[PDB]
């Protein structure tokens, strides 16, 4: 039912994301270790937990850019549009990738091979309850959709090619690039669950949810600033913290 062109398109996205992902696993013993045990009033341990998370965030941004560069169409856009689309999508793709790593049985997200954290751990990494509850809520709703690799890969490509992002100078081209991926996901979902026609809409609706969650994160970011910011340069640059 998938055309040969669609099978190839999807195979390459799934392979592109596996290649981007194994690059991250190469530099896992290079992230600040999560403090094992440690007195719960140690301010050094508090600092390490924050740094651990912001270093996982940096690896996530590297995976995202590395994947984007492999999505056909992406490198043919102007450089400034490439930047505009990546600046807007980064948080949203980070959250889709967090959702993919959620375990509903144990209610915990596993970053890289085996950095498994609960809500308590997100809070000890310096995150506020206003952001943590939605993240886990979104992850829980994504889990029930039961997305596979092809579906995540396609949804991410679709999310990157959102024409209405701020500062995109050629939205016509960007929207035109979104269409083959939307159509590939429409055909893929129709084959996987041919009885459930509302699965494809339910997935596109998550992109609506990701817009709100993007705002919730910007509030979290302005909240860090008013309490000892200390986000690394790549992260404070992308998310426009200083300029």
């Amino acid at each position: 039912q998938l055309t040969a062109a669609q099978e190839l398109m999807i195979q390459q996205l799934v392979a592109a994301q596996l290649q981007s992902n194994k690059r991250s696993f190469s530099d896992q013993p290079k992230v600040t270790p999560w403090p094992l045990g440690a007195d719960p009033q140690s301010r050094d341990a508090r600092q390490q937990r924050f740094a651990h998370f912001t270093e996982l965030a940096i690896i996530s941004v590297q995976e995202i850019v590395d994947f984007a560069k492999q999505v056909p169409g992406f490198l043919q856009l102007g450089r400034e549009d490439q930047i505009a689309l990546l600046k807007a999508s980064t948080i949203e793709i980070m959250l889709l990738e967090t959702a993919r790593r959620y375990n509903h049985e144990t209610e915990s997200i596993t970053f890289l091979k085996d950095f498994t954290y609960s809500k308590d751990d997100f809070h000890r990494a310096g995150l506020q309850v206003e952001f943590i509850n939605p993240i886990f809520e979104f992850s829980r709703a994504m889990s029930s959709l039961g997305l596979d690799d092809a579906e995540y890969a396609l949804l991410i490509a679709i999310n990157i090619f959102s024409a209405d992002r701020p500062n995109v100078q050629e939205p016509g081209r960007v929207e035109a690039l979104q269409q083959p991926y939307v159509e590939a996901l429409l055909s893929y979902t129709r084959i996987k669950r041919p009885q459930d026609q509302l699965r494809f809409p339910r997935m596109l609706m998550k992109l609506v949810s990701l817009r709100t969650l993007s705002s919730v994160h910007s509030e979290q970011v302005f909240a860090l600033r008013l309490a000892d910011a200390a986000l690394p340069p790549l992260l404070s640059e992308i998310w426009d913290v200083h300029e």
Binding site: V65, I83, K87, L234, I238
Partner: peptide, 12 residues
């Protein structure tokens, strides 16, 4: 903005 660090990642 220059976005120097994102550009660096895009370059290689």
């Amino acid at each position: 903005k220059e976005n120097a660090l994102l550009r660096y990642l895009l370059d290689k």
